[PDB]
Amino acid sequence: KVHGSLARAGKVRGQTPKVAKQEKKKKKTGRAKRRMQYNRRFVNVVPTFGKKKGPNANS
Amino acid sequence: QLIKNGKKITAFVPNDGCLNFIEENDEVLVAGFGRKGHAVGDIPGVRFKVVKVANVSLLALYKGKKERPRS
Amino acid sequence: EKTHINIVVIGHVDSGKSTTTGHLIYKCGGIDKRTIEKFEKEAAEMGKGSFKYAWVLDKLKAERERGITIDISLWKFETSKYYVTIIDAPGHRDFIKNMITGTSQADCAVLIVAAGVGEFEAGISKNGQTREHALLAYTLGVKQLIVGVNKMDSTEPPYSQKRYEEIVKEVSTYIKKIGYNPDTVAFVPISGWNGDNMLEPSANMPWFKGWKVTRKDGNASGTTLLEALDCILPPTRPTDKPLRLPLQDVYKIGGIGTVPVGRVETGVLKPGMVVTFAPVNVTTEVKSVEMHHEALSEALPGDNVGFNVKNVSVKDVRRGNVAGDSKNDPPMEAAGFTAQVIILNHPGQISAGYAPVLDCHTAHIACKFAELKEKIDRRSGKKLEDGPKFLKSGDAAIVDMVPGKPMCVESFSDYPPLGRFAVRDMRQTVAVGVIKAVDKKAAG
Amino acid sequence: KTTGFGMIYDSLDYAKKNEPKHRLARHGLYEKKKTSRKQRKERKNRMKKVRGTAKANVGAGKKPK
Amino acid sequence: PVARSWVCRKTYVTPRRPFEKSRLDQELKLIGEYGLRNKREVWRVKFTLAKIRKAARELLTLDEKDPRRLFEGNALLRRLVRIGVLDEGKMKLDYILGLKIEDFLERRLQTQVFKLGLAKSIHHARVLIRQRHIRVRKQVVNIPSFIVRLDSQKHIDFSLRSPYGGGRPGRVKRKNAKKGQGGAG
RNA sequence: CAGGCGCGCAAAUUACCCACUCCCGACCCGGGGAGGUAGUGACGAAAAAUAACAAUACAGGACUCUUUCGAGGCCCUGUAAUUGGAAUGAGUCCACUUUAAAUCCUUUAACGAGGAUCCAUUGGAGGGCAAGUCUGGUGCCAGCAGCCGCGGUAAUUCCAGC
RNA sequence: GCCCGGAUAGCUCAGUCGGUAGAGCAGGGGAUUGAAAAUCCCCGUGUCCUUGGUUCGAUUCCGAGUCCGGGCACCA
């Protein structure tokens, strides 16, 4: 017995609540962007001792 | 049904609600599924995928850049 | 050097439009003699020998086999003062759609009414198209009328003054009700089959002392149909506006490609200009502008012209699409628009959700009545009551309309030509109206 | 800085003879305002149809048109 | 049918492996210190170094009696000395193999403007160069990757028409001065 | 050679010129869609913008001294931080040059940057493979997923925001 | 542009000249399961393509239009 069908195609995309992108500053581009990465990864290295936190750590 | 030779194939339509853009008897640009003539993933025996419909890209339709040529 | 005017021939079925036009073109030199005998022999062998001059315009196999005009046909000829492009419109009510396409792109309308025993009454009856055609001509903006009573040879007695005079009195009455001032209209007794009183006065009507027209900007007098054409007032061409050219057909000329043909309404069309088509949203530079097989350097308003576009298929642009400059104010699709509509004759009651066929320029799209905004006065849009719930015949109202298929329209105020319309239903002209505001989609 | 090339002639009459025509026109010396190559080619092929001294007349009679 | 030349080549070679952490970190470190817009810039110098070091390798394979070893062996060393990556006391092909990436791109024009003291940051170096402020001998050079040679290292300085120097002021202050002249009266 | 149609997933202007390159001819003089020139051109290749600085500020290192604390100046970094006025070319636009004539490029005068809105995208974020077990929605559906696999009401993988 | 036929539940197919559209299949809700399937209970879930005409009234009567299918034609 098949539960999916062609009438319900694109269901979750339609029902997903719509949240708008918020106005934010433009990101630095080109050499300036590579400058930002260099500082965030190598210059501002705060020691942690225990274990490394990823660039996008959420814990 | 391919125009150049009249052969009949089954083409997968990618993404969430893209089948709604397609209607019956529309000109569709079709490409391979990436496995050089073999089925991809769990879809059984489908070796093709749809890239453009009604001479407009499925991605631009899915991303809201353009709309099914409404006449 | 001449002035180009667009002339539409209108009237009831079998009133002699095509014959009158074909003979008039032949007399003025628009077609070679030898071609007429080619038509004369071939029409007789098909069993339609009476359509000898009608075959000049009836080019289709179906038109020639059945002796009926189905679609408009254009031809050119010169009246020693006007370079005239004449349009032959079908007389059938089933082909009123092709009329409105041809009639829209016209500057003067010649109305052909058959002076025959019982033939005239059939045209001017309720179920005839003589009344309807004159009504649509005024609705579509044609403000210059020439009434030529045809088939005068077939009266009883032939070339009867009394028949001619009674038709003038009756036709005048109608034209006056619908807007045309009879004193500004030239009535010409003609015999399209025999070519009587079209170029030179006919001995068969010595009683006819001529026609007189009393018009502002000139009073004219004459006897023949050609002199009636020569008295047409020169139309005013809106040249200082962005380009607007409603398409009436698209052809695939061998060795040239896609050549959309249509009449430019406003602005100037020149080769090398990048034009855009609405509502199909196709932008392309024009390669050449040709009119009547003759090369052009610029298409001034009122020049029905065809033009070569680059890398455009025939299927992309169709009849009813509007062509305009991409650099200047470009035409755009209308999601909806607001109209002042006067209901003429609907048997019942008109409420929101009504979907009659709306005819604007060359576009015939079934538009849906979305909201009855308010009831206004007829002679002046003075409001009367908000939200009429329903409208019946004789009521003028403000209506918001949402077309079914994509359609490009403009307000009458900015561009008079592409705002006029006629709602059509029940095989009748239900209502007419003008367009005040257009909700153009951004298309970006 | 700006480099370049210069030619200085013994006399103007010599500069008349052995010098490119375009550089002469740059000084207004030998100016010509002629027809396009296409118009000449149109005329040349039209004259190829006719024969005799009529060749000059009809080609010249159709050149302004 | 055409008087054109189609001779062209790529100045760089992409990595064999797209996402290798150590290579990514080292390339970022280099881009960061020598102020380089993109990772293509680290690969261009890497490609030039690889071709040069590869060229030195078959020469070292050939014996010292090889005439071919001597000619382009001497020429290759001379080019390296001229651009300033090899010391004039270093006339051995064996010493080319010890060259590193930072050596070649240390000779870049943008690094020299910051080092010579013309610019106060490596990112200020590119801005000055791209804005037409630096001459080498007498010619303004707006290419940050301009490889300075020893013959021209001593001559790098501000351009004559640069407002920073014997130059009429730049447009932004010109607009303030007329404001000052208008503001005064 | 352009240009049209058809075919197709699939490929440009019905442009200007003999000035260059060279060819033919009785010929220093004529002609040449050969060829050159511009147009279209993200086929492909090369160079290279989308900021930089200075101070205040707040964490943080940093350099020294000192009750360990603490302190002072100094180097460095994150903040459409608080600003501030410097710089410039994309752009528009005299001339000039370019060139057969033009064009672009090169130069120059004017003008032209703060949200310097003059606003960089395309793909991905379980592993292979660089990057969240964040939050909302859906609930073996919708979808994803080159492969392994994810989804059956707390999805590191769908649809979204960050 | 012209002509011909069709349009009723998610699918298919019924439906009297005019007395307020059903059948099967599918699906939904509940019991059950970790979630299903099976099993056991309940539920048409459809603007009769759209819109006007006429009628006491319209899916079934007649027009206009849209889409689909078929055929014909269209050379500034």
Ligand SMILES: Nc1nc2c(ncn2[C@@H]2O[C@H](COP(=O)(O)OP(=O)(O)OP(O)(O)=S)[C@@H](O)[C@H]2O)c(=O)[nH]1
């Ligand atoms: N006696 C007479 N017969 C005429 C005259 N004009 C036309 N006819 C005949 O009437 C018939 C119909 O003419 P026709 O040309 O078809 O009119 P029409 O208005 O163009 O017809 P349609 O296109 O609206 S269908 C033809 O057979 C023609 O021979 C006329 O002036 N006098």
Ligand SMILES: *C(=O)[C@@H](N)Cc1ccccc1
């Ligand atoms: C072309 O020139 C247009 N005037 C349209 C047209 C004229 C004559 C015949 C057919 C089309």
Ligand SMILES: [K+]
């Ligand atoms: K030459």
Ligand SMILES: [K+]
């Ligand atoms: K995500």
Ligand SMILES: [Mg+2]
């Ligand atoms: Mg598998």
Ligand SMILES: [Mg+2]
């Ligand atoms: Mg009859």
Ligand SMILES: [Mg+2]
């Ligand atoms: Mg006719």
Ligand SMILES: [Mg+2]
């Ligand atoms: Mg008949």
Ligand SMILES: [Mg+2]
């Ligand atoms: Mg007829």
Ligand SMILES: [Mg+2]
């Ligand atoms: Mg009768």
Ligand SMILES: [Mg+2]
């Ligand atoms: Mg020559």
Ligand SMILES: [Mg+2]
């Ligand atoms: Mg930008």
Ligand SMILES: [Mg+2]
């Ligand atoms: Mg991965």
Ligand SMILES: [Mg+2]
């Ligand atoms: Mg990883």
Ligand SMILES: [Mg+2]
């Ligand atoms: Mg959840």
Ligand SMILES: [Mg+2]
């Ligand atoms: Mg059905």
